[PDB]
């Protein structure tokens with residue numbers, strides 16, 4: 065669980081980076097569909113899950129959109145993400161697998177976009193943070 | 207996170223089965239290094255490492271104590287388990303990936319030993335509690 | 349991978365005394381409940397509201413039995429596993445949209461439900477063989493997800 | 495072992511431009527910082543109660559490069575990586591008793607440090623390529639954990 069060290073660094077970073085949120089999700093979501101083809105499973109209904117399709121694009125808004133949300137609700141993500149834990153559960157029944165997938169892909173994007181800011185230290189906290197985010201989305205699974 | 211129901215689930219089950227937890231931890235420990243010899247990096251300090259090992263008989267004892275503890279702290283695993291954390295995390299530098307495995311084996315020794323009590327309901331609840339425990343055990347890592 | 353003779357042995361035995369039509373449903377039933385996102389791929393079933401429905405559902409038994417048979421091919425061709433499940437992957441892939449992670453889940457439950465079924469005669473050594481074989485099948489089963 | 499031809503080049507392009515003296519230390523540093531359990535094989539190398547020190551610990555700089563040069567040996571033998579690494583793999587286990595999941599964490603930190611250098615060159619395609627290579631070699635190094 066996040067220290068105040070962690071909450072401290074997560075916010076600064078996203079304070080630093082949070083303005084690219086729409087690009088980070090497109091790129092990161094593109095990575096996912098690309099490097100981890102099995103995830104395409106959740107986009108079958110999508111007219112075409114091509115890389116960085118705008119629908120993909122727009123959707124990375126939403127994704128990254130949920131990260132900012134998680135930022136502010138950082139002090140407690142359980143409460144914080146139950147609507148998304150509801151969508152991504154009873155509606156989509158998304159395997160918890162892919163959250164860590166996405167989560168890894170997000171750290172890579174940010175990494176590419178902000179090598180100066182994404183220090184090690186700002187990695188472990190952002191790392192630990194996404195995991196709590198991963199776990200709060202699981203809240204409504206079972 | 208654990209529910210009122212899950213908590214009842216895992217306390218019912220521990221009521222029926224806890225009488226043989228010594229018994230349960232010997233084999234669950236026995237099975238971990240057999241089925242997953244890679245975990246032997248750790249207990250290779252042991253004078254005896256094969257199932258049959260009185261060292262293994264003795265330590266399995268311990269692990270289910272610990273799981274006796276955790277059932278007693280189920281409403282607050284992080285706090286209940288901080289001494290166990292810091293040991294496995296700080297001192298013993300176990301890898302969190304390894305908690306997943308002994309629970310697997312714990313999940314399987316229980317089913318052999320308590321088929322009729324180990325409902326699918328009992329299971330989904332003990333399983334959440336076991337990661338639940340893994341999470342508490344991992345508080346002291348980074 | 350390679351197989352000791354014992355592994356070969358242990359595995360042959362397991363599937364032979366196994367009661368394909370009984371452990372099938374049990375393990376697939378148990379998966380849907382413990383890992384409810386795996387009810388995804390079991391849409392139109394009619395009554396999967398609570399657990400007990402799942403359990404008493406015909407369209408779960410089928411597949412759950414379906415599944416044990418499908419490993420007979422892998423017990424049959426221990427060393428052509430990959431080729432063996434080739435079309436089965438693509439199936440689950442491009443049509444069934446089965447998440448690959450779903451495979452290990454079901455593996456884990458077949459094991460728990462069998463361990464209950466086998467009691468003490470589900471030795472550690474038997475588990476190693478059973479899980480190693482199921483692994484190889486799982487991997488192969490997620491292999492043509494492009 | 496299947497290797498498309500674009501894959502080959504990518505891992506070739508990548509392994510051509512990459513500064514083993516820079517990267518390497520950086521990638522072992524982050525994994526010791528981001529996954530502090532892996533430090534159990536690099537404890538007494540200096541105050542590991544410190545990022546800035548760890549970063550700038552000699553001991554750590556060095557093995558990181560060994561790591562990257564070590565991954566080089568497999569960048570040539572792209573069709574027999576196992577046999578390549580089997581020694582190194584038989585080493586890390588019996589010798590230093592390393593947790594082969596640790597090989598997971600470090601590859602990640604590599605893949606993430608690498609990313610920070612290529613920046614916008616590190617395509618999704620480039621990530622896959624790079625990542626599947628890392629994967630493949632990883633079974634190899636945990637292979638003789640027995």
Ligand code: HEM
Pocket residue numbers: 103106107126127128129130131148151152156158162163166197
């Ligand atoms: C950081 C974790 C995630 C966040 C913050 C997030 C956020 C969101 C949001 C905000 C929406 C709906 C927005 C709206 O319609 O207003 C959504 C829907 C959706 N998300 Fe995510 N998501 C996450 C993880 C994932 C992952 C890992 C997958 C794929 C494996 C995924 C697949 C979907 C799907 C399938 C939908 C429904 C619509 C569609 O894609 O057709 N989500 N998510």
Ligand code: HEM
Pocket residue numbers: 245248249265268269270271272273290293294298300304305306308309339343
């Ligand atoms: C289910 C999660 C776990 C529980 C409840 C648990 C419990 C315990 C307990 C009660 C002790 C006794 C030490 C003491 O307090 O004096 C212990 C020690 C130890 N644990 Fe675990 N443990 C867990 C997971 C693991 C795993 C997965 C590993 C490695 C694969 C591990 C490795 C060790 C080692 C090496 C020791 C020290 C034994 C000695 O004193 O020689 N633990 N653990």
Ligand code: HEM
Pocket residue numbers: 386387388389390411414415416418419436440444446450451454455489
């Ligand atoms: C050991 C792993 C598995 C094996 C060997 C296996 C095998 C099979 C086979 C051979 C079929 C026949 C095709 C058909 O019924 O149309 C089938 C059907 C199917 N399987 Fe799997 N399966 C496995 C795991 C899964 C999992 C984990 C899921 C999703 C949770 C899944 C979802 C389905 C679905 C939706 C059908 C379609 C049945 C129908 O439409 O009649 N399978 N399975």
Ligand code: HEM
Pocket residue numbers: 532533535536557560561563564565582586590592593596597600631635
């Ligand atoms: C891609 C994965 C890795 C590769 C290719 C690799 C490669 C190497 C190489 C080339 C050596 C030098 C052998 C020698 O100097 O005798 C070495 C030694 C060593 N490796 Fe790594 N390594 C990897 C990951 C790891 C990890 C994750 C750990 C755990 C922290 C680790 C622990 C060690 C240790 C403790 C040594 C001993 C150094 C010595 O005494 O020379 N390795 N490895």
